[PDB]
C-alpha cells in the first residue's frame, strides 16, 4: 500500500476511459475502476494495481519491494499522466477550441503514455499500422495471452507485455499464430533483437526519429506515434487520421485538412503542450464522432 499525492484533482474515470478495451488484458486490465498489470522490474514480473482513494490521491498496491516504490511511482506517474496540469489548463484556456476540449474532458489532466516500455510502444505502434484500434488491441491481447507474463497476486491475475526475450522465443511464427501479418511479425522480431532499446526514451527527438525510421517498414507516422505516445516527446503525429479529423472538425469546420496543414495548426496553437493536446484529440475523435 502506497499513496501518490497530487497537487491537483484528476478525474480517474476519464483517465480509464482512454483505454479502448479495458476489460481485456492488453496487457492492462481495468475492472470496477481498478487499473492493473504486471510489469517487469529488475528481471522479474511484479503485480501492480492503482485506484483513487480521493480526487487527489491514487492508491497503489503490489508485490514489489518497499525499496522499489520510488521507481514504480515514477513509472506510474509517467504512464498514467498524473503530473500537475495547472500550466496545461491555463494554456488550453487561451485557445477557443483547446478550452472546449479541456471542458469536455475536464480532469483528464496531462498525457500519460501508451506503453510501460519502449519495446511495448514500438511493437504496438507496428501492430496498429493500417488497422482499426480495436483490432490492434485484440491482437496485442492475443500476444500478451501467449507470450506475456502472468502474475497471480491477492486473488487476481496481472498480465504483462512480452519481454524482448519472450518475443525472440516466440519468433515470427509465434506472432503470425496470434493473427499478425508476416511482415509485422518480422519487424517486431527485428526490433526485439535491439539491445539497450529502453535507452531510446532518453534520446533527442532527432536521433530517435532517424533510428526508428531506419527500420524498413517504419515510416513517419509510426515513428512520430512512438515518439509522442511511447517516448513522451513533444512530437505531433499529424499523419494520424484521427488527429487530422479532430483538428479539421475543431479548426476548419469539419473540412478534412492535409497533414501539413494540421502540422501548421499544432505549431501555431498547441506549442509545448502538443503531446498533451494529442490525447484530448484522440478522445474527441473517439467520443464526439441514411
Q: How far is CA 200 from the centre of its chain?
A: 16
Span near Na ion by CB under 5 A; candidates 18-26, 80-88, 112-120, 264-272: 18-26
Q: Is 218 in the site for Na ion (CB under 5 A)?
A: yes
CB closer to Na ion, 205 vs 257 = 205
φ and ψ of 26, to 5 deg: -115, 15
Indicate which single residue of 10, 26, 229, 273 sits in contact with Na ion (rule: CB under 5 A). Answer: 26
∠ CA 130-131-137, rounded to 5°? 135
Residue closer to Na ion, measured from CB, 19 or 153: 19
Residues 28-57 interacting with Na ion (rule: CB under 5 A):
28
**DSSP per-residue letters across 117-166:** SHHHHHHHHHHHTTS-HHHHHHHHHHHHHHHS-EEEETTEEEE-PPPHHH
Q: Does 222 bind Na ion (CB under 5 A)?
A: no
Q: Is 128 in the site for Na ion (CB under 5 A)?
A: no
The residue nearest Na ion at its CB is 26
Q: Does 213 interact with Na ion (rule: CB under 5 A)? A: yes
The distance of closest approach from Cβ of residue 272 to Na ion in the complex, given in angstroms and rounded to an integer, is 28
Look-up: residue for cell 479529423? 245
Long-range contacts, 167-175 (Cβ 8 Å, 24+):
167/123, 167/192, 168/192, 168/193, 170/143, 170/146, 174/146, 174/147, 175/143
Count of Cβ atoms closer than 10 Å to residue 96 Cβ = 10
Minimum distance from CB of 136 to Na ion (Å)? 12
240 noted as active-site residue: yes
The residue (of 2 and 215) whose beta carbon lies closer to Na ion is 215
**Judged by CB under 5 A, does residue 63 bind Na ion?**
no
Question: Beta partners for 29?
Answer: 36
For 36-99, give the DSSP string. Answer: EEEEEETTEEEEEEEEEEETTEEEEEESS-GGGHHHHHHHHHHHHT-S--HHHHHHHHTSHHHH
Nearest to 106 by CA among 245, 4, 8: 8
With binding defined as CB under 5 A, does residue 208 bind Na ion?
no
Which residue among 28, 95, 239, 240 is the active-site one? 240
Shortest Å distance, C-beta 127 to Na ion: 14
Binding mask 154-193 for Na ion (x = CB under 5 A): ----------------------------------------
Assess 10 for contact with Na ion (CB under 5 A). no
Active site residues: 240
Q: Which residues bind Na ion (CB under 5 A)?
A: 21-22, 24, 26, 28, 213, 218
Amino acid at each position: 500500500m502506497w499513496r501518490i499525492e497530487l497537487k491537483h484533482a484528476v478525474n480517474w474515470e476519464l483517465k480509464m476511459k482512454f483505454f479502448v478495451l479495458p476489460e481485456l488484458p492488453t496487457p492492462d486490465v481495468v475492472e470496477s475502476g481498478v487499473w492493473r498489470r504486471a510489469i517487469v522490474l529488475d528481471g522479474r514480473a511484479v503485480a501492480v494495481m492503482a485506484y483513487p482513494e480521493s480526487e487527489r490521491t491514487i492508491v497503489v498496491e503490489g508485490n514489489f519491494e518497499n525499496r522499489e516504490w520510488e521507481a514504480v511511482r515514477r513509472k506510474l506517474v509517467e504512464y498514467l499522466g498524473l503530473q500537475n496540469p495547472e500550466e496545461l489548463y491555463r494554456f488550453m484556456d487561451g485557445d477557443e477550441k483547446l478550452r472546449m476540449l479541456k471542458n469536455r474532458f475536464y480532469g483528464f489532466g496531462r498525457a500519460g503514455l501508451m506503453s510501460m516500455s519502449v519495446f511495448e510502444g514500438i511493437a504496438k505502434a507496428i501492430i496498429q499500422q493500417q488497422i482499426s484500434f480495436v483490432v490492434a488491441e485484440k491482437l496485442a491481447a492475443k500476444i500478451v495471452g501467449r507470450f506475456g507474463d502472468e502474475v497471480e497476486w491477492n486473488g487476481l491475475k496481472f498480465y504483462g507485455f512480452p519481454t524482448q526475450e519472450a518475443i525472440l522465443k516466440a519468433g515470427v511464427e509465434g506472432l503470425r499464430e496470434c493473427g499478425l501479418s508476416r511482415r509485422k511479425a518480422e519487424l517486431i522480431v527485428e526490433i526485439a533483437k535491439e539491445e539497450n532499446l529502453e535507452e531510446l526514451k532518453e534520446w533527442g527527438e532527432e536521433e530517435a526519429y532517424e533510428y526508428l525510421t531506419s527500420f524498413k517498414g517504419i515510416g513517419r507516422w509510426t515513428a512520430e506515434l512512438v515518439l509522442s505516445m511511447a517516448l513522451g516527446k513533444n512530437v505531433f503525429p499529424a499523419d494520424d487520421l484521427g488527429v487530422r479529423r479532430a483538428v479539421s472538425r475543431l479548426y476548419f469546420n469539419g473540412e478534412i485538412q492535409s497533414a501539413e496543414k494540421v502540422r501548421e495548426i499544432a505549431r501555431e496553437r498547441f506549442g509545448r503542450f502538443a503531446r498533451d493536446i494529442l490525447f484530448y484529440l484522440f478522445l474527441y475523435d473517439r467520443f464526439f464522432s441514411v
